[PDB]
Amino acid sequence: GSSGSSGGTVSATSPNKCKRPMNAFMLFAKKYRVEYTQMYPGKDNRAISVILGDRWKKMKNEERRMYTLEAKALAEEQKRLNPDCWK
Numbered sequence: 001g002s003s004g005s006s007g008g009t010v011s012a013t014s015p016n017k018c019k020r021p022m023n024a025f026m027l028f029a030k031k032y033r034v035e036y037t038q039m040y041p042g043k044d045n046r047a048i049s050v051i052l053g054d055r056w057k058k059m060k061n062e063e064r065r066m067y068t069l070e071a072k073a074l075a076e077e078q079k080r081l082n083p084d085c086w087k
Contacts, residue, residue, distance in 0.1 A: 019087070021075045028056055028057040029068075073083040 004020075022030075029052045036048045043051075056064065079085075 002079065003085045004019050022071050023075070023080050024064060024071040025053070025056055027071045027074075028052065028064075033083040073078050 032052055032055070033048070034042075036051060040048060040051070062078060
């Protein structure tokens with residue numbers, strides 16, 4: 001089951017513990033989350049993210065494929081595991 005059509009006059013709030021899928025970038029910023037958390041302890045979380053994106057923009061087409069295809073499987077599987085999705 002699927003659910004979560006377009007919104008209505010909704011702005012950017014950036015909630016937490018949401019119930020969204022794991023897109024390509026998501027797998028990157030995540031898989032590389034702690035990677036920068038220990039490499040850049042002097043920086044803040046808000047910075048760790050900004051830097052992460054930069055790498056995704058500098059990377060190549062194949063360098064991102066690892067997350068593109070990978071995330072895809074998760075984007076489809078997650079739907080199978082959650083057949084009861086009305087929200």
